[PDB]
Design a protein around this ligand. Structure first.
Ligand SMILES: [Zn+2]
Ligand SMILES: [Zn+2]
Lengths: 553, 555
């Protein structure tokens, strides 16, 4: 039986792995996975924020199709998920870590789905059976917890080892400590320079790695395990030795220009003119945060070394497909922005490495695929991997198995799509854009990236071949009107897709074309000679009496 | 306050121009005209797909076919798509069916969610949200591969057999067949037999029968109800009892709307719909001569039964408590535009009659008026929710409430265009023309001035100038002088395809409230030190004490 180990890191940039070219951050264990598999050089997520990116990946569907369009927007009860597609192919689907799922409680109540039943618990958890659900943080303020269940098992783990605090996740894993015993919260970016006040083996990435091994040891039958880490997502703080390993001298140059800010499209400027944008535009903030970010990733690589060594030693490596990816990047000050909520590659292009242990993937080991790839491709890839037939009237991406197995070196699509709905975001609050206007679309191929705003008639446009850093907006350039028209055609073609026709497969639709004519539907037939007599056997040669004769009783 | 009841009356395959209040010159429909005189008549109402199943699924969900996915006859409406019944029950009003829906249960989706067909919830999901007084999609065809719909006319056949009628298919032999002088059944499935009177007592035929069931339903009710009274006539078989069978002839039939140039210059996909057996059939004089008088006769019978129904409502004091809606799921070409049936976008199919009577005082001001604003069949669901006293969920429902028009707040809708869609990937015409599932789709966008038709199977659109060519005879889709108008209409279509119709788990109100929620729940971003944000936001993070981690560790 082949198993699938679906590994994801939150907020990990494509260019912060050495196999993707980082100059000072060496990630040999992840690089080694790539050397025995395929590295995807052009992989894009479908929304630049945790919740909606993940919901797209777990459904294999675009945000425009599934409707879970921002953090905390529930995925509706009707939408089937990865776990559903895999279980129909005989493979279990399990969670170790983060999903950012919010149950559609209203929808469940409407259909009488109980959250404590097998079917109900799965719907509430985005199709996963849960080994451990942890979205990876326990923030709190005057109105309470962002997520009361954050770090629930992790805090029990720390308290059992002897840590004591009314928030051990905060005080140890995500804060430093000064000489006088004062907790230095990792929520303050200046404290990113401090080592986390925790034994390194007890911090979050090593913890979740141990949990993955515990799951794998226990689980029989074919399984898919979504191993889903919160780091390098904030708080940006890491234990020794990773804390001391990097400094500002190791940070790659920020990618931005004065002209870019001067000539910023009004909606682009809006995302720069935020607390986070202005913060990460400051040298002292990048000097503190980015070496910590790097340390988090180096720690991840060491834990992948640990995990992969264990799969090898226990003989599981030859029967486990491994996928390694991210839900989105982090601008880290690039383009005068912080966080991730815009369309430049620094956020929307993600690392993606796939290792298929089977001999049919031998021909492509160590190769680099430069074809247009979307995160929604993972679901049909997994179904095919599990020996199933991907239901392509529901799943909108494409299986990557033909690429892995050397049947072709490219996908079939001619463009990728990303979407961002900021109707629920603090930023629409400030610029008071209407809910209906607070949305943007991205369409890109190898040559161009077009950004459409519903709140502004002018698009943004980047020449990806000659401006790969995406610093020069050509959206207002008359010389590019034809190119802009062409990309808009691509976006329009995509919006017209029939993504909601999920209740009949293409084969079933074709079969319906000839069914009714033999079931008595007779149209445009004047007399019995105008259609085959076989079709009207139920209608001809019949006898009856005048109706009055049946009624005179 | 809200109306107590909603009577939602629909006829299948009824044309907008075959009511005398919409201008028909020989077919007098005084009872329906009288209702129009008491209410508002909508002169520009369009359905969202030109075939029974998907038109109805759109109306019952308040959503476009592109949104709900039940895109042709027999394609199940997925579980989880909410229906009119759900919205109305949320507003405290029951929602009941008497007649046709063409609903097909999403059996796989129900199985997946553990939904049982016999539970209250499961039975409602299976029936498109309606509680069922009587489900009858209105016909019992049968061929060598069996019945199209085995449960067609199920209770109706029992009714007829109870009266003494005897047949293995009473619906066919009596209600939808004639009889010659030697006792030979003349099937209404052959159009030549449209000229024959149906071999059945008039009071026992389908439209009076269903009208009687509707009165049975209503008299059994205590408490607020919406009743979908859903007639199959004047949909085929085209045959009717006396006296309707004899009251019209070819001398009463309005001229066919078509031209030789229309045919000569037809777009290849337009031509494909002409080049069918039904198109060819209704292009023949003898066929229209037989069928259209029977079609008229069926409508005249429907008018007489509305008279009966409305008189009963008045006499029992229900007229004061009952909103009445009368409409159609689509028209019938009857040979117009060289086509039969209904599956294309000309007004003869896509524009439907729509009359709404609101008995409340606030609609007194608009009685007898005609509203020429762009209206869609998906407008009914939010209209009903608001009439029932609820707040329509406009993050789910895609149309607009017509209540402001009825109550005289404005005389127009807000939309700048209408949409109609036709997915023929499952249809005979796709087999006949070898069109792929992916390319067997067409879109219609129209306003008061223009109608644009987009085909996925051909790069050239069709375009009609509705203002100067209201009969839609002249295709301007290839005319270079209309390039800008075509671009402009495509912009309207593109705007509509970008709509966020699937974000149904959060309302506008909830999305707005979400904007500030995380701020006081510990999400602190871009903050360098405690002086860069208000102190209360970081109260759980500041001034805390701990020991070096080594000190906690032992064992
Ligand atoms: Zn994330
Ligand atoms: Zn119909």
């Amino acid at each position: 039986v082949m198993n699938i180990l679906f590994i994801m890191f939150d907020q990990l940039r494509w260019d912060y792995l050495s196999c993707y070219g980082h100059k000072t951050l060496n990630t040999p264990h992840i690089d080694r996975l790539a050397a025995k598999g395929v590295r995807f050089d052009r992989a894009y997520i479908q929304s630049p924020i945790c919740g909606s990116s993940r919901m797209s990946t777990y459904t294999g569907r675009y945000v425009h199709s599934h409707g879970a369009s921002w953090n905390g927007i529930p995925l509706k009860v009707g939408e089937m998920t990865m776990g559903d597609h895999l279980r129909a192919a005989g493979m279990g689907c399990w969670l170790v870590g983060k999903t950012h799922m919010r149950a559609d409680e209203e929808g469940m109540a409407r259909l009488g789905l109980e959250p404590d039943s097998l079917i109900g618990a799965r719907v509430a958890e985005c199709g996963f059976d849960v080994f451990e659900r942890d979205d990876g943080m326990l923030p709190e303020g005057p109105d309470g917890y962002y997520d009361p269940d954050g770090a629930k098992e992790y805090n029990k783990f720390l308290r059992a080892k002897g840590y004591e605090s009314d928030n051990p996740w905060h005080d140890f894993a995500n804060s430093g400590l000064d000489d006088e015993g004062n907790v230095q919260s990792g929520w303050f970016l200046k404290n990113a320079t401090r080592p986390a006040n925790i034994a390194e083996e007890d911090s979050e990435t090593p913890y979740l790695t141990s949990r993955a091994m515990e799951f794998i040891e226990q689980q029989t039958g074919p399984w898919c395990c979504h191993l889903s880490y919160i780091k390098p997502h904030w708080p940006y703080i890491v234990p020794e030795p990773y804390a001391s390993m990097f400094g500002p001298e190791h940070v790659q140059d920020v990618v931005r220009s004065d002209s870019e800010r001067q000539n910023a499209h009004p909606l682009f400027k809006a995302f720069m003119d935020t607390k986070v944008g202005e913060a990460f535009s400051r040298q002292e903030v990048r000097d503190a945060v980015i070496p910590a970010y790097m340390g988090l990733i180096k720690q991840a690589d060491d834990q992948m070394g640990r995990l992969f060594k264990w799969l090898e030693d226990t003989g599981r490596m030859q029967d486990t497909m491994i996928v390694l990816t991210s839900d989105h990047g982090d601008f880290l000050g690039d383009h005068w922005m912080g966080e991730k909520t815009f369309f430049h590659d620094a956020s929307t292009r993600v690392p993606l490495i796939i290792y298929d242990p089977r001999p049919e993937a031998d021909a492509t080991r160590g190769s680099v695929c430069d074809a247009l790839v979307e995160s929604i491709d993972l679901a049909p890839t997994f179904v095919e991997a599990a020996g199933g037939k991907p239901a392509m009237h529901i799943l909108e991406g494409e299986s990557l198995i033909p690429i892995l197995h050397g049947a072709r070196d490219h996908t079939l699509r001619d463009h990728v799509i990303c979407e961002y709905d900021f109707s629920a975001s603090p930023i629409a609050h400030l610029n008071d854009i209407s809910v209906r206007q607070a949305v943007m679309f991205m369409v890109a191929d190898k040559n161009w990236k077009l950004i459409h705003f519903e709140a502004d008639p002018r698009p943004m446009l980047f020449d990806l071949k000659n401006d790969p850093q995406e610093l020069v907006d050509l959206g207002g350039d008359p010389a590019h009107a034809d190119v802009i028209a062409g990309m808009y055609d691509k976006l329009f073609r995509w919006t017209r897709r029939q993504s909601q026709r999920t209740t009949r497969s293409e084969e079933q639709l074709i079969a319906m074309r000839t069914k009714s004519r033999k079931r008595g539907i007779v149209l445009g037939i004047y007399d019995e000679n105008e259609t085959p007599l076989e079709l009207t056997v139920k209608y001809r040669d019949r006898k009856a009496r005048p109706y009055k004769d049946y009624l005179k009783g």
